[PDB]
């Protein structure tokens, strides 16, 4: 869980300590990451979704989820994938809420995002390149 924090790793260092890690020889190339980042802009519907979906069943299924308060938006980072079922959110909100309505406040994604039925999903998988590990 901690490794997905906004200020994880080198972001804890300050002053010369940060500079030495930032300019270290091993950190002059990118490093593959299994994570995804999801940004949701704060609103009535989104704040409900954060509290009762992402911070409960979502973190239950994916305990590596980190949710940070960035004033105007929510910053979420997790290993592997993050999913939000617009059907679950509509049940919680008590009003019409398709997957198209959920995207109204889905602000940004770092990873491979897509909608499938009522579910929005952002995943580390490289669809079209990664080969399916099961025939199911």
């Amino acid at each position: 869980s901690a490794h997905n924090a906004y200020n994880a790793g080198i972001m804890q260092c300050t002053g010369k300590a940060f500079a030495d890690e930032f300019f270290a020889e091993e950190n002059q190339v990118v490093h593959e990451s299994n994570a995804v980042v999801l940004v949701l802009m704060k609103s009535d519907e989104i704040d409900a979704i954060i509290e009762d979906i992402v911070l409960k069943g979502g973190k239950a299924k994916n305990p590596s989820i980190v949710v940070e308060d960035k004033a105007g938006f929510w910053w979420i980072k997790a290993d592997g994938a993050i999913e939000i079922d617009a059907a679950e959110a509509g049940e919680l909100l008590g009003k019409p809420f398709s997957v198209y309505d959920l995207l109204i406040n889905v602000s940004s994604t770092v990873g491979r995002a897509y909608t499938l039925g009522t579910k929005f999903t952002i995943t580390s998988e490289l669809m079209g390149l990664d080969r399916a590990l099961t025939d199911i």
Binding site: E91, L92, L93, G94, K95
Partner: protein
């Protein structure tokens, strides 16, 4: 400098925001955040429609379903309660049970009608720019449409006014919303018919969009004699608000109004080259089906199947249906005399065509309403009764 103090905003004034932050507890004082959580959900989850509507009416426990107690604080001279059981013959274990399947509280209702309002004006500006009125049959336009579709506005207007006592008398919040939205849609129908007439007058020199000829036809032409008599009875002859809603929407408008609007003017528009009227009948027919959804829930789901008063209620509904179906058959029998004025089109305005139209209207009605309250009806008998008024 103004005479009154410029009030500092507690949200943004640093001194007042600091005072407020010191007073606000650092934790919530209850975790139940669902507004009126105790409402019994009709669907799998409680809807915002229900939260905003349900139990707004302050009924006491002696009006079935109410959560309050005691007598009203002020009653009519004589003793008539603010709301009371004397307002209708029908009975139920809970007047709050009704739910509009479209879940219309005020905002989604005006939101949807705003779309139709603005798109309508964009369509008319383009339709006039298109010149598409050039291909409409002139006799249909001048002698059938302008006069008898215009006269039909008075049927929609009378059905609209039938809801005035319903808006006052009815016994729950969701019923009141269902009733008032239905009334606006009816007066909308009347205003949209007059809008189409005013619009054609801008395109056709000599086309008179005055309501004089339509009104004379509604009040004196035998074609609308049965229809006007029915509307006058539904609107001003009764005050039982369930009788008004049922007779208005589930019988009269479901048979006569559906035939006039959909089978005659909408269908024959697409036989006489009328590219304008279908845009307007599309709205009245959309409103009808939305109104039917809610009317059907009130009378079928709630009242005709109420666990204690279902059969009791079906007795009154069957008596009303008998009366107002006879009124509507008579109205339709008068109305079909108008086919003697239209150009013959095989399968449309000949006896076979009219017969199949009445078979749809009465057949659909039997499925949608008659079968659901236990009212036996011979469709072919009602079709043949109307065809007695058709000039071969």
């Amino acid at each position: 400098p103004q005479s009154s103090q410029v009030t500092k905003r507690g949200l943004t004034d640093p001194e007042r925001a600091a005072i407020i932050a010191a007073a606000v507890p650092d934790h919530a004082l209850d975790t139940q955040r669902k507004y009126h959580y105790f409402i019994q959900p009709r669907w799998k989850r409680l809807s915002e429609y229900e939260q905003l509507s349900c139990y707004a009416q302050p009924n006491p426990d002696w009006i079935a379903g109410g959560l309050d107690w005691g007598d009203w604080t002020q009653k009519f001279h004589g003793g008539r309660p603010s709301w009371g059981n004397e307002s209708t013959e029908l009975r139920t274990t809970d007047w709050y049970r009704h739910r509009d399947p479209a879940r219309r509280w005020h905002h989604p209702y005006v939101k949807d009608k705003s779309e139709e309002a603005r798109y309508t004006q964009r369509f008319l500006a383009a339709y006039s720019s298109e010149g598409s009125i050039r291909t409409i049959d002139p006799y249909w336009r001048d002698e059938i449409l302008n006069k008898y579709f215009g006269a039909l506005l008075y049927s929609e207007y009378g059905l609209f006014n039938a809801h005035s006592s319903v808006g006052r008398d009815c016994l729950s919040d969701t019923i009141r919303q269902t009733a008032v939205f239905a009334a606006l849609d009816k007066v909308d129908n009347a205003q949209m018919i007059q809008m189409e007439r005013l619009f054609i007058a801008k395109l056709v020199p000599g086309f008179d969009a005055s309501t004089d000829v339509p009104k004379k036809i509604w009040t004196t032409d035998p074609i609308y004699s049965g229809a006007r008599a029915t509307v006058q009875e539904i609107w001003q002859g009764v005050q039982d608000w369930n009788e008004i809603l049922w007779a208005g929407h589930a019988v009269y408008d479901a048979t006569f109004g559906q035939f006039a609007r959909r089978e005659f003017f909408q269908r024959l528009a697409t036989v006489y080259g009328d590219t304008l009227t279908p845009f307007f009948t599309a709205q009245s027919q959309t409103y009808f089906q939305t109104t039917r959804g809610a009317i059907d829930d009130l009378f079928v789901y709630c009242l005709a199947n109420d666990s204690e008063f279902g059969a009791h209620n079906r007795t009154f509904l069957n008596a009303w249906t008998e009366h107002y179906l006879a009124s509507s058959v008579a109205a339709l029998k008068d109305f079909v005399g108008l086919y003697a004025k239209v150009e013959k089109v095989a399968g449309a305005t000949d006896r076979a065509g009219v017969s199949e139209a009445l078979q749809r209207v009465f057949g659909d009605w039997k499925i949608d309403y008659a079968d659901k309250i236990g009212f036996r009806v011979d469709v072919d008998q009602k079709v043949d009764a109307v065809l007695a008024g058709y000039k071969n």
